[PDB]
Design a binder for this molecule. Sequence first.
Ligand SMILES: CCCCCCCCCCCCC/C=C/[C@H](O)[C@H](N)CO
Ligand SMILES: CCCCCCCCCCCCC/C=C/[C@H](O)[C@H](N)CO
Lengths: 46, 282, 282, 48, 245, 245, 97
Amino acid sequence: ETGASSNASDKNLIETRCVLNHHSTQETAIGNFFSRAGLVSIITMP
Amino acid sequence: DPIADMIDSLTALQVLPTAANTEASSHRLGTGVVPALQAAETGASSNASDKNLIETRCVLNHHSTQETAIGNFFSRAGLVSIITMPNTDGYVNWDIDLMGYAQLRRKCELFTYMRFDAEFTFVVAKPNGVLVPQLLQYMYVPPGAPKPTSRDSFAWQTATNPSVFVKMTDPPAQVSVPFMSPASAYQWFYDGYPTFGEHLQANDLDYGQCPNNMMGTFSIRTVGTEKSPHSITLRVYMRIKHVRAWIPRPLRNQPYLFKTNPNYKGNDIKCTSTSRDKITTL
Amino acid sequence: DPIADMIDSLTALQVLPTAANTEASSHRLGTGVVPALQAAETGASSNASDKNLIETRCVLNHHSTQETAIGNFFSRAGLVSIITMPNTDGYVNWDIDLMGYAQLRRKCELFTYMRFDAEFTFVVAKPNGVLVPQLLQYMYVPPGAPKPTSRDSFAWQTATNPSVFVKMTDPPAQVSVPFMSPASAYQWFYDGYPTFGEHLQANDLDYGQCPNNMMGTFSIRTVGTEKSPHSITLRVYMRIKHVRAWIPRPLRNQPYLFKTNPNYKGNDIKCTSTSRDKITTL
Amino acid sequence: TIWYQTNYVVPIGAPTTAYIVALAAAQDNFTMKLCKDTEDIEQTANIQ
Amino acid sequence: SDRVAQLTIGNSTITTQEAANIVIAYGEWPEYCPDTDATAVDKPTRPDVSVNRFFTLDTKSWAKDSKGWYWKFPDVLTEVGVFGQNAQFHYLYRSGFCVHVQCNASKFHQGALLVAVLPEYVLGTIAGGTGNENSHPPYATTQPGQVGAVLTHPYVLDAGIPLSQLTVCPHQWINLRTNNCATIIVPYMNTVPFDSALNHCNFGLLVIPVVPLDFNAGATSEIPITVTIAPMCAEFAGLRQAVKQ
Amino acid sequence: SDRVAQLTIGNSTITTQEAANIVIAYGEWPEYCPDTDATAVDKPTRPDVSVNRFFTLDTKSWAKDSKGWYWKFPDVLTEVGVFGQNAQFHYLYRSGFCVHVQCNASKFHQGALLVAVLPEYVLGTIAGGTGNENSHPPYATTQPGQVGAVLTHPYVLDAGIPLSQLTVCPHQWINLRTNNCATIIVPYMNTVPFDSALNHCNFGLLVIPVVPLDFNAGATSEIPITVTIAPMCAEFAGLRQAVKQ
Amino acid sequence: ETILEVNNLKTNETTPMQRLCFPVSVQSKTGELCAAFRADPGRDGPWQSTILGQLCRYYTQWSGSLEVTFMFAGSFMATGKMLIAYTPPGGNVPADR
Ligand SMILES: CCCCCCCCCCCCC/C=C/[C@H](O)[C@H](N)CO
Ligand SMILES: CCCCCCCCCCCCC/C=C/[C@H](O)[C@H](N)CO
């Protein structure tokens, strides 16, 4: 009800191991999300 | 600590740009030292050399080992697909499976696992080889994305899908493709089933199918709304770059039959060697 | 180390020779500090004292806590056996089970586990209490040893078994017996079965029988080859020394029926208290 | 799956049926890759 | 704000908002067996996550004339999960427990349960009624499994010992106006460092309604009681083929 | 005096007096998964004695016209012991293996077996004989269990690849005049750090008689072949109810 | 966090505001299940109504941990205990608690 999202993590709910992950966050940046050519118009001269 | 039992590779790499030199040797007579007698049951290859079996001279040879490196063995464009638009409504959806042509398939299946970047070249012409001014569009459809249902489908808007627009009188198109498996390598051999459940005889096609190699759909079309009067023939070629390979395998001695299984014709088993008449006469 | 997760009591004793002193206290008026309100649901006993509920004086008391120590509570000889030789061939083999008399049984069953040394006294007379010049022999037969089958058996040679020769006109014999269980304590309650297998209704007698408490056979005889004309009555008394006890239990409020089980008469359940007529009139 | 551990207990005067709202998000080790076309929007007819 | 609690062990979590303290039985936490107390020479196995986790048993129904229930440990878990498989393939076992009993009701209900742990709970019979039969309890009574059994004479605890001094054992209450749960952490208690899991029961858990359940007509009449348990430092030794009993 | 060997792991010991070396496949010993290569976040279980021990399968009979046998790993052990129970209760598994094949005969017998380990041994069919049917091998063929299966066309290894270059894989020979056993230690080989034990087989063990068995009439004609295997660094993760297949 | 449509029934399609909450009631038998759904954020089902399940559809592969939050909207006078389980792959919905 406070409008805040949950702050519970993996380590506080279950017993976890150590994971060193190197998954990049580059592709979900909005520059990479939008820099793709898409169709905006089709113009015809009959 | 009250509990005392809770307290708790063989070889390395070397750079060898040339083949090995030969040292000079003389005769040898004695007991106890027998380098020619081996034991093949240990699983080890023979370690006997030239200098221990015959009398040798000194040879300083500079023969390079660069061409047999697996980067030079694989960086050659080979045919992986032939797509035709005689499929009479002006578009083809082709499911990406690069095991349909025997020459590149036998080279890649020397190893079990492989991780590489690719380079795809699209050589397009008419079925007799003539070229016409005609605009085409190639689109890569990843798994989960909507595939086109007609020539004027909404999926050709390609707002996020990567797409190439090209003409037939142009040079062939080239793109670079990264390593895009969810695993750490591609495997040409997957011993098992993808899903759980019972494995009955009607679902025996599932055996050997790895979804980590399924990369989606490659779609082509002629761009305009109206029907084109030209027949299309597209040939796809693939170079393998930045390659790593694991676990060598026996090379196949039987002709291929299907794209997804190692099935072989059982009535004509080919012998690996060429036969002769007698063991004493060559 | 490449793997990081493979790297990895409340109270104490005090000597209290006397009971606790009382401090002087005065009145107390205020909010927030309520030592009289408790919470019995936590499983903890109340920690409220004299000085927080009433106004007290200073009392320096020197009442000793020595007699309620479990060494003083248990070091008293109580009856464990009555053996009679009217058994008409001059010997008795008695299987050692000390749970046949209710007074020492209820004291020992206050705890679950107990580890002690013992001292056994043998008070022997005629059935009417008269004493005669008569030689007797008591032998302890450990489990596995041969027990005597007659008055002139070979087992009375006692070459390794401990034996006492005594006369009836002598003082009573006393011996010291160590702690001889294969476990670390004797248990008066064993919730389970000794052996494996199926547990059918015909083998329900096995429930509750611990072989760690079974100590063997106590044998008596008159020494001579010929028959003695005197009847014998032997009373055995046991003191408990060097005692350690664990896990207190509820004391039994029902009369005992058998020596090996907690069975009780179900048609006459005794209430623990003495009844009255009204809750307001004592 | 969600199960009853004990019952839904209620006194007199309060309703015997309640409702649960489920909310979902991602953690801080969440990533995505290989950006592609979605399949939720379509366009069969021309817009405007 | 100590009325809220969270118990996390393994891949399981219990949350409660209406609680008393946690009782640690005899002031001792469960431990592994040290080298000075051990006697068996083979190396024991410690699975440490697949066996040390919360296990939820079947659910009882508290009626207005309920007598009480009991469970036997570790007999409740000898057919459940990876703990039940390690207890059948091995000859020796050793572990402590964390017992959690749940019972919620509204603010217009009343009643009180006594939740106690009694080690070496040996059961008796009524001796045929008249006291002349040397009767013995059946195998379904002494080891009832994960379902549990009902007490016939709860005033003498079916063993000739009174309920009124059962609070000399580690215990809690579930008073319906105060809390809805009880939590006892039990160490390993035996005369031997290891024992059999199929032949011997270390302790029994007793849940008896001392004050009976009461409510007015129109409120919820289905008041259930759930028991959730967790092994703590489970060790197993003496590996051989699987033996069920 | 390196012809004698002793392999002790768990509560099991193998002795041999007529042996070659031990082959360590690709020069690598089995290991647990490090933190840099792992992806799953839950803590795995490592039983370390009850699963890392020698397991003896059924025994074959070497005749004078035997084709060969194969086994699939870890499919041979998914119903055996505590390893077979951890593989059913968990979703992910990871381990290496120590394979030991035994075959003894007298000094008047002759014959040679090739004992090889082939990772990702995918089987083919004869495609209906004529090559026109897209046939697939049945489930009893691709995963034969602890019994194993017989090779139909051993010259092409039932997969279209020749026997003559099977020695590019980690292998040993059992030559009856020289030794009576073969030992290969295999690490974990996959494209993923953990995988399913019921859906995926890492490698296959092939035992093929290259030189056929021969003896004169009057000697012992019952020459058996026994396979004994041991997991080495077995890990399990993803605990859930038991799934058999 | 955005709302998960666990109550995505075919009878709810003409009154679609009921798909945002699922009921909980007084039971007669013990250990019943209230709801069951898959934990796949990019699959068709209850995860389609979330902004995480909508932005996943623009990508091909995903990784990482998820979270589901359940909020009880009953009376102050109502009590109860629920068991919310997550099962790794290998089987169907579990038959009992
Ligand atoms: C406009 C660009 C279009 C080009 C898109 C090409 C992407 C596909 C690259 C896949 C790389 C090889 C993946 C595996 C191929 C084999 O078919 C599998 N191993 C099947 O066994
Ligand atoms: C000549 C010496 C004879 C005396 C031999 C006496 C040895 C026996 C001592 C046993 C000490 C008590 C052991 C347990 C007694 C009870 O019967 C068991 N707890 C049965 O429940």
